Design a protein around this ligand. Structure first.
Ligand code: RZR
Length: 167
């Protein structure tokens, strides 16, 4: 039993809710919140900008030190950093950005990072400003992630479309 509330169950291990991931993180304090990161951990907009703003820029400060030490992430890769006031940990995962021309097949590799964590609160990777089809992202999530994932979808219209079209 966990504290996630109001989710629709899609499969054995995937759950979905129309919610603001920032507000959801603030209320649940999950062990892991996933950030829709880029390789430079520059949290300017989308989910990343929202999560970082909610940390009063502490996420960005920590991220800049991480990059200065380790260099950029790979597309499809991830790193674990602090969750600050939102979660115990933040798993920064880089899905391909279609608006940068990155290979969508890398979306499966990106979701594989979730399997290293038993339970996660997450957005749909590569959705929103990353330019992928969220219906496709949900399909890859369901077919790749085996651990327990609670997906937060900010847009109610998109949420309803994702549920209604789910196979
Ligand atoms: C004050 N609170 C807030 O600003 N919250 C806030 C702001 C923006 C987003 C967002 O862009 N999310 C989408 C996003 C972004 C980048 C990559 C993939 C996805 C999928 C997400 C979705 O469409 O569900 C989510 C929450």
């Amino acid at each position: 039993v966990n504290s996630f509330s109001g989710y629709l169950k899609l499969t054995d291990n995937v759950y979905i809710k129309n919610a603001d991931i920032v507000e959801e993180a603030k209320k649940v304090k999950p062990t892991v919140v996933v950030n829709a990161a880029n390789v430079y951990l520059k949290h300017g907009g989308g989910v990343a900008g929202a999560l970082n703003k909610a940390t009063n820029n502490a996420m960005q400060v920590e991220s800049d030190d991480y990059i200065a030490t380790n260099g950029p992430l790979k597309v499809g890769g991830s790193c674990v950093l602090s969750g600050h006031n939102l979660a115990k940990h933040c798993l920064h995962v880089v899905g391909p950005n279609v608006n940068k021309g990155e290979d969508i097949q890398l979306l499966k590799s990106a979701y594989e990072n979730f399997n290293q964590h038993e339970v996660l609160l997450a957005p749909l990777l590569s959705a929103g400003i990353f330019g992928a089809d969220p219906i496709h992202s949900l399909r890859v999530c369901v077919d790749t992630v085996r651990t327990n994932v609670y997906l937060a979808v900010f847009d109610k219209n998109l949420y309803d479309k994702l549920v209604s079209s789910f196979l």
